[PDB]
Design an enzyme around this catalytic site. Sequence first.
Site, PDB file in Angstrom:
ATOM      1  CG  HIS A 197     -52.784   9.502  29.166  1.00 18.97           C
ATOM      2  ND1 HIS A 197     -52.119  10.684  28.414  1.00 18.97           N
ATOM      3  CD2 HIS A 197     -52.893   9.938  30.502  1.00 18.97           C
ATOM      4  CE1 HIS A 197     -51.779  11.647  29.264  1.00 18.97           C
ATOM      5  NE2 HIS A 197     -52.330  11.148  30.705  1.00 18.97           N
ATOM      6  CG  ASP A 236     -51.101   9.124  24.396  1.00 14.97           C
ATOM      7  OD1 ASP A 236     -51.281   9.077  25.572  1.00 14.97           O
ATOM      8  OD2 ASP A 236     -51.300  10.207  23.750  1.00 14.97           O
ATOM      9  CE1 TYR A 291     -52.458  17.332  25.033  1.00 16.71           C
ATOM     10  CE2 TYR A 291     -51.490  15.609  26.348  1.00 16.71           C
ATOM     11  CZ  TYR A 291     -52.226  16.048  25.481  1.00 16.71           C
ATOM     12  OH  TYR A 291     -53.633  15.329  25.465  1.00 16.71           O
ATOM     13  CG  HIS A 325     -58.489   9.101  26.361  1.00 21.36           C
ATOM     14  ND1 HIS A 325     -58.124   7.977  27.182  1.00 21.36           N
ATOM     15  CD2 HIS A 325     -57.378   9.998  26.090  1.00 21.36           C
ATOM     16  CE1 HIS A 325     -56.665   8.160  27.337  1.00 21.36           C
ATOM     17  NE2 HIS A 325     -56.502   9.542  26.777  1.00 21.36           N
ATOM     18  CG  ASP A 360     -48.942  11.782  25.747  1.00 24.22           C
ATOM     19  OD1 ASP A 360     -48.598  10.608  25.431  1.00 24.22           O
ATOM     20  OD2 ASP A 360     -50.207  11.938  25.869  1.00 24.22           O
TER      21      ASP A 360
HETATM   22  O1  K70 Z   1     -55.294  12.707  26.103  1.00 24.09           O
HETATM   23  C1  K70 Z   1     -54.321  13.037  26.931  1.00 24.09           C
HETATM   24  N1  K70 Z   1     -53.110  13.083  26.751  1.00 24.09           N
HETATM   25  O2  K70 Z   1     -52.684  12.666  25.458  1.00 24.09           O
HETATM   26  C2  K70 Z   1     -55.088  13.512  28.413  1.00 24.09           C
HETATM   27  C3  K70 Z   1     -56.349  13.427  28.525  1.00 24.09           C
HETATM   28  C4  K70 Z   1     -57.009  13.492  29.996  1.00 24.09           C
HETATM   29  C5  K70 Z   1     -56.270  14.347  31.008  1.00 24.09           C
HETATM   30  C6  K70 Z   1     -56.871  14.890  32.334  1.00 24.09           C
HETATM   31  N2  K70 Z   1     -55.936  15.633  32.886  1.00 24.09           N
HETATM   32  C7  K70 Z   1     -55.688  17.119  32.426  1.00 24.09           C
HETATM   33  C8  K70 Z   1     -56.709  17.496  31.824  1.00 24.09           C
HETATM   34  C9  K70 Z   1     -56.978  18.706  31.225  1.00 24.09           C
HETATM   35  C10 K70 Z   1     -55.604  19.631  31.320  1.00 24.09           C
HETATM   36  C11 K70 Z   1     -54.418  19.075  32.115  1.00 24.09           C
HETATM   37  C12 K70 Z   1     -54.617  17.912  32.495  1.00 24.09           C
HETATM   38  S1  K70 Z   1     -53.312  17.080  33.872  1.00 24.09           S
HETATM   39  C13 K70 Z   1     -53.951  15.404  34.470  1.00 24.09           C
HETATM   40  C14 K70 Z   1     -53.100  14.719  35.588  1.00 24.09           C
HETATM   41  C15 K70 Z   1     -53.841  13.500  36.068  1.00 24.09           C
HETATM   42  C16 K70 Z   1     -55.061  13.164  35.635  1.00 24.09           C
HETATM   43  N3  K70 Z   1     -55.913  13.970  34.596  1.00 24.09           N
HETATM   44  C17 K70 Z   1     -55.256  14.911  34.211  1.00 24.09           C
HETATM   45  C18 K70 Z   1     -54.870  14.398  30.785  1.00 24.09           C
HETATM   46  C19 K70 Z   1     -54.422  14.090  29.518  1.00 24.09           C
HETATM   47  K     K Z   2     -51.115   4.052  24.952  1.00 16.26           K
HETATM   48 ZN    ZN Z   3     -52.109  10.964  26.400  1.00 16.28          ZN
END
Ligand code: K70
Ligand code: K
Ligand code: ZN
Length: 362
Positions: free
Chosen positions: A178, A176, A309, A138, A269
């Site tokens: 995301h 991943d 996670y 990211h 994830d």
């Molecule tokens: O790098 C990731 N994964 O590999 C990744 C990166 C950012 C997020 C943002 N965030 C979080 C952020 C911190 C703790 C829990 C969550 S849950 C969530 C749901 C919907 C949108 N944002 C969210 C999540 C994952």
């Molecule tokens: K990806």
């Molecule tokens: Zn991710």
Amino acid sequence: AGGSSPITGLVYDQRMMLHHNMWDSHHPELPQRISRIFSRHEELRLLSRCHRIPARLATEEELALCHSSKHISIIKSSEHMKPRDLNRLGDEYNSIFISNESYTCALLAAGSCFNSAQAILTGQVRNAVAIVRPPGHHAEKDTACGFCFFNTAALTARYAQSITRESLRVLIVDWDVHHGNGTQHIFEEDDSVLYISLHRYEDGAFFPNSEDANYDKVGLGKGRGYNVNIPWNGGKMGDPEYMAAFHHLVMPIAREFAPELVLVSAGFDAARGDPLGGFQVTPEGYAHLTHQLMSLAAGRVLIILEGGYNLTSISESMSMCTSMLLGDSPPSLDHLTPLKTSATVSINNVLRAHAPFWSSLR
Ligand SMILES: O=C(NO)c1ccc(C[N+]2=c3ccccc3=[SH]c3cccnc32)cc1
Ligand SMILES: [K+]
Ligand SMILES: [Zn+2]
Ligand SMILES: [K+]
């Protein structure tokens, strides 16, 4: 002389556990992610089968391969910041926490992958697995995002080119759950680095919440055709859907591209059990994705940990990948749900977008 059995490398360093969230010790990007994966490698008797590759720090000059001088300087300054200022600086980004050890850990994650890429490209090992954190994909040229400070995978691609040849064809496969927004943008105009991402999209409502992740984003300029987004909408995807995307899209494009090095942005994830992704990929599924990628680039595959996670799920899944890298036979798929209608829709959208650029899809 006369050939030898190939070697799998593994890099893991306990120092990368030092990065932590001092306000929320239950933040999903846990120090234990890397130590739990490493511990699972010991239980399965995989660790002693690998050649241990040391960590090192990335240099600031190496970071400049992908990141701006301002961004490097700001993150660099955080090692010496007081608690009040670390919170304010982290809050200046989308979903970032910072400690005094964060900068050093990001350097170690990158440098670990540089050493692994160097070991692969010099023939010391055939392939390697990198148990590193924080994640990278990211991170943008000029900013941090989404638990990522520097784009480890993007940096590794540029490092490989710097020690071999500038035009060296690097494939980055990002499985991943995301979208790797940072990796896409760095290489969006680049035909020497093919980026293929699979990700939960939900019409732009899933993190990172940008329509840049849709299938119609094919690259710019000379990079047209060299950015492949495979976006999932409406459904919890698992082994059947990922196996179909690999069969119809990832592997045909990759084989036509003919990479000389494969980097995997290997978040876990999308795994069954992961509370951020909601998908159903099994450890055996990840093993089969790894095995197909091993057929590219004469087996020069570097697996770089991204997200993931559920500590049990990521540990089993990543260890399945190392087992494949070591040459073990891929396991049988227990379950095989009929594929989802919506996965076919997504796959067909990518095909109609990339057929102009790839003869293997026509
Ligand atoms: O790098 C990731 N994964 O590999 C990744 C990166 C950012 C997020 C943002 N965030 C979080 C952020 C911190 C703790 C829990 C969550 S849950 C969530 C749901 C919907 C949108 N944002 C969210 C999540 C994952
Ligand atoms: K990806
Ligand atoms: Zn991710
Ligand atoms: K590209």
